[PDB]
């Protein structure tokens, strides 16, 4: 199972996205769903670093299958729409693969 | 619905 | 191989992306490159609809292998940023899986 923990602050701005279980065993369906979520996540970060001026605190432990985006300029409207685009894409995956991925809002 | 194998072949 | 033809008008706005073919990386059900590109594509398209006022012209082979996005309101900045994000994500997949996916700007 891939878990995605998403933290929204009081004003609606995405603070933190944490994905884990990327590099864990998993059941039938895992290989593709993990490939889907990770391409969306790393894709989004690259877009946030190349299209906007926001420079988020990023921590990827390739060994742990633990990946963490922490927003720094939470008022960067462009970065924030890339993050909410990522969430939508992640939700699209959840809708059809409920057994392999779960989103949790905090 | 979504198909993660939309761009994969049959054979 | 999946080819991704992108057309960008005089002003730099993305008006068409056409994605054609199959990745031919693995077996049907376990192709990770296809899982990556698909999640990014459908994620972006749905996000556009969900997060902005733009309603793109979408035409595709519902048996797989062909998707077309034409932008309508090309001036919509929110939608154009989501399309850019998509391109950067797919480029991220290209640079690690060189022979499975190709981007071509027109
Ligand atoms: Ca909270
Ligand atoms: Ca909006
Ligand atoms: Ni963490």
TrEMBL record, chains A, C:
Keyword Phosphoprotein: no
GO molecular-function terms, A-Z: cysteine-type peptidase activity
CDD domains the UniProt entry points to: Prp-like (cd16332)
Residue spans crossing the bilayer: none
Record-linked InterPro entries: Peptidase_Prp, Peptidase_Prp_sf
Keyword Repeat (UniProt): no
Keywords: Hydrolase, Protease, Ribonucleoprotein, Ribosomal protein, Ribosome biogenesis, Thiol protease
BP-aspect Gene Ontology terms: proteolysis; ribosome biogenesis
Record-level GO cellular component terms: ribosome
Pfam families linked: Peptidase_Prp (PF04327)
Sequence similarity: Belongs to the Prp family.
Record-given protein name: Ribosomal processing cysteine protease Prp
Natural source organism: Staphylococcus aureus
């Amino acid at each position: 199972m891939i878990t995605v923990d998403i933290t929204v602050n009081d004003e609606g701005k995405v603070t933190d996205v944490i994905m884990d279980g990327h590099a864990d065993h998993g059941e039938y369906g895992h290989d593709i769903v993990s490939a889907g979520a990770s391409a969306v996540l790393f894709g989004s970060v690259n877009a946030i670093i190349g299209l906007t001026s926001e420079r988020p605190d990023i921590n990827y432990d390739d060994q742990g299958g633990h990946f963490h985006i922490r927003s720094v300029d939470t008022n960067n409207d462009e970065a924030q729409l890339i993050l909410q685009t990522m969430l939508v894409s992640l939700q699209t995956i959840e809708e059809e693969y409920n057994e392999n991925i779960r989103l949790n809002y905090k | 619905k979504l198909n993660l194998q939309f761009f994969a072949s049959k054979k």
